[PDB]
Design a protein around this ligand. Sequence first.
Ligand code: ZN
Length: 255
Amino acid sequence: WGYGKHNGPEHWHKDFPIAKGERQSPVDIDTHTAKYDPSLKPLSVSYDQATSLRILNNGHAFNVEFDDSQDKAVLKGGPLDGTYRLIQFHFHWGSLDGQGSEHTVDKKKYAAELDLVHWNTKYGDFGKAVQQPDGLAVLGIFLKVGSAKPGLQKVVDVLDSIKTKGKSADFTNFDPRGLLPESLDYWTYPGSLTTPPLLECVTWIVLKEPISVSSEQVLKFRKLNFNGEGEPEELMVDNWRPAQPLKNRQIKASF
Ligand SMILES: [Zn+2]
């Protein structure tokens, strides 16, 4: 599976039938139809004690891994029940600044989308969790192009080292707090993973307020390779999946 003309998202259903299930992601957030729900609690992001380990190019994106052996970086509150531990974060970007994000707002596409993946500690590990309806919590943040983001530069600067598929680099002392928007106002709905196995085990939390990245920042993202080292070069661009049908589901807003 991949993002080209022949193994792209329109083909995923052949191997991953849940590709056309009832709670697929991403979706288009219609802000006039989203429901303001007063019973929604504020998000609780505890990342001060986060331990980053490495960065790797898995052939579809680049993932920043964190030590989740203990409650060091956790997410709670909001529409969640229990404590969700950060496992990794990754992005989805386009070839141009006019597309990238997976989740869209009023049909608007952002330059890229940052997803923080967390799993429910009541299930013991990540693997058990993906087998559960309330198994994961993904925090989505849109990136728009304007001013640079100091907090993202450490990541940008290490991309040269993991150009191709399979490459990884030690990546310690990286603080995720530097990627959060000022406001934690959000939209929430029941969905799934956006890449196979598309397991419908996620509670999505999409932040209203986007973060800005400079053009050059984003540029470094478009220099990645889908391919392994020593193969023809496939630039890693447009690794995002198209919005899926809402199908009954309701999108709730915390504002
Ligand atoms: Zn993703």
